[PDB]
Design an enzyme around this catalytic site. Sequence first.
Site, PDB file in Angstrom:
ATOM      1  N   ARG A 169      -0.439  15.015  27.882  1.00  0.00           N
ATOM      2  CA  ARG A 169      -1.142  15.838  28.904  1.00  0.00           C
ATOM      3  C   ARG A 169      -2.639  15.518  28.926  1.00  0.00           C
ATOM      4  O   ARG A 169      -3.216  15.448  30.024  1.00  0.00           O
ATOM      5  CB  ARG A 169      -0.889  17.323  28.600  1.00  0.00           C
ATOM      6  CG  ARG A 169       0.601  17.658  28.624  1.00  0.00           C
ATOM      7  CD  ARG A 169       0.843  19.090  28.225  1.00  0.00           C
ATOM      8  NE  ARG A 169       2.239  19.308  27.918  1.00  0.00           N
ATOM      9  CZ  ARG A 169       2.747  20.466  27.457  1.00  0.00           C
ATOM     10  NH1 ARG A 169       1.938  21.498  27.240  1.00  0.00           N
ATOM     11  NH2 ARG A 169       4.062  20.582  27.233  1.00  0.00           N
ATOM     12  N   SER A 170      -3.274  15.442  27.764  1.00  0.00           N
ATOM     13  CA  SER A 170      -4.708  15.087  27.602  1.00  0.00           C
ATOM     14  C   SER A 170      -5.042  13.777  28.310  1.00  0.00           C
ATOM     15  O   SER A 170      -6.108  13.690  29.000  1.00  0.00           O
ATOM     16  CB  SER A 170      -5.044  14.998  26.130  1.00  0.00           C
ATOM     17  OG  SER A 170      -4.991  16.283  25.485  1.00  0.00           O
TER      18      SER A 170
ATOM     19  N   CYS B 239      -4.146  18.745  23.716  1.00  0.00           N
ATOM     20  CA  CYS B 239      -2.806  19.333  23.929  1.00  0.00           C
ATOM     21  C   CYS B 239      -2.255  19.515  22.523  1.00  0.00           C
ATOM     22  O   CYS B 239      -3.019  19.966  21.667  1.00  0.00           O
ATOM     23  CB  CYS B 239      -1.941  18.489  24.875  1.00  0.00           C
ATOM     24  SG  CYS B 239      -1.995  16.688  24.601  1.00  0.00           S
TER      25      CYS B 239
ATOM     26  N   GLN C  26       2.408   9.536  27.525  1.00  0.00           N
ATOM     27  CA  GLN C  26       3.487   9.447  26.485  1.00  0.00           C
ATOM     28  C   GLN C  26       4.840   9.076  27.095  1.00  0.00           C
ATOM     29  O   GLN C  26       5.733   8.696  26.308  1.00  0.00           O
ATOM     30  CB  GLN C  26       3.652  10.782  25.747  1.00  0.00           C
ATOM     31  CG  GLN C  26       2.708  10.939  24.577  1.00  0.00           C
ATOM     32  CD  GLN C  26       2.975  12.221  23.813  1.00  0.00           C
ATOM     33  OE1 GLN C  26       2.717  13.326  24.290  1.00  0.00           O
ATOM     34  NE2 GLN C  26       3.498  12.089  22.607  1.00  0.00           N
TER      35      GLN C  26
ATOM     36  N   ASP D 161       7.774  23.327  29.492  1.00  0.00           N
ATOM     37  CA  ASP D 161       8.204  22.924  28.122  1.00  0.00           C
ATOM     38  C   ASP D 161       8.788  21.501  28.143  1.00  0.00           C
ATOM     39  O   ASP D 161       8.491  20.753  27.192  1.00  0.00           O
ATOM     40  CB  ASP D 161       9.207  23.915  27.516  1.00  0.00           C
ATOM     41  CG  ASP D 161       8.589  25.064  26.728  1.00  0.00           C
ATOM     42  OD1 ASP D 161       7.354  25.302  26.858  1.00  0.00           O
ATOM     43  OD2 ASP D 161       9.345  25.732  25.970  1.00  0.00           O
TER      44      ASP D 161
END
EC number: 3.1.3.48
Length: 284
Positions: A221-222, A215, A262, A181
């Site tokens: 994440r992508s 994602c 990110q 998370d």
Amino acid sequence: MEMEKEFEQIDKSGSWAAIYQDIRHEASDFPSRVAKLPKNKNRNRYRDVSPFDHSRIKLHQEDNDYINASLIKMEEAQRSYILTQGPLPNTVGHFWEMVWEQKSRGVVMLNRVMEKGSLKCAQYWPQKEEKEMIFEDTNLKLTLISEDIKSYYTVRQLELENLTTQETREILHFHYTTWPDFGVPESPASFLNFLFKVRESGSLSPEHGPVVVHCSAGIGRSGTFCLADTCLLLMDKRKDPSSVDIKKVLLEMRKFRMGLIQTADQLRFSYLAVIEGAKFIMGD
Ligand SMILES: CCNc1ccc(C(=O)O)cc1
């Protein structure tokens, strides 16, 4: 510079936040005018994440051709990826239209439907074989065929039918279920295992349309998944594997979709995955 030496130097200097801001400063800026049209407001999950006009996937319909999805074409690596947001309640039918029209074999999902107590994307695939899904707006049927649940990921076989022509195709769903998370995984071992499972399936190969990767926003994440895949492919292909520059591959990818990777931790982690990947392949 051998990137593991670059890695040790950034780590010992604690300068990850400084490298990351340098990438943010040099990144391409292209118009996103279609994404911002008032008719498209309910097709965007996040106001600050939009596809560029030049690289956006167009739906094959005269009504409204817009979906929040980008084609990332890596010329030297000879790999293409579609990066997209997690589908919304009103874009699930558009999502599966895009898969159909682009001839994709695989869908790669890097988030859980619920994270941090909030919905990160719609339940866009059937959970039981005997309860199929019909998308009336795009005229598609989707059926669960089989499900293989492992400790770090789940693989599903799905059947997608164009109800207009009664053609069917098998789609493979690769679902990474263990990304934490907060922050990034402590070791890249399970993420590399997952990447090699996608490659083994045929989903990333040039006989199919581009893989669809998502994602929640389709950038963090992508971005990590496609950056690690492309860097490992270039090391396999080139005469001088030590010349593969991860920061230059990231900037090239950011010409096709904004904001890929990110956080400074995601950058540091992307470095971690490529390094660990280059030795498994030297077969230490
Ligand atoms: C010379 C230091 N850098 C590298 C060494 C080997 C490989 C590889 O064989 O994948 C890539 C980079």
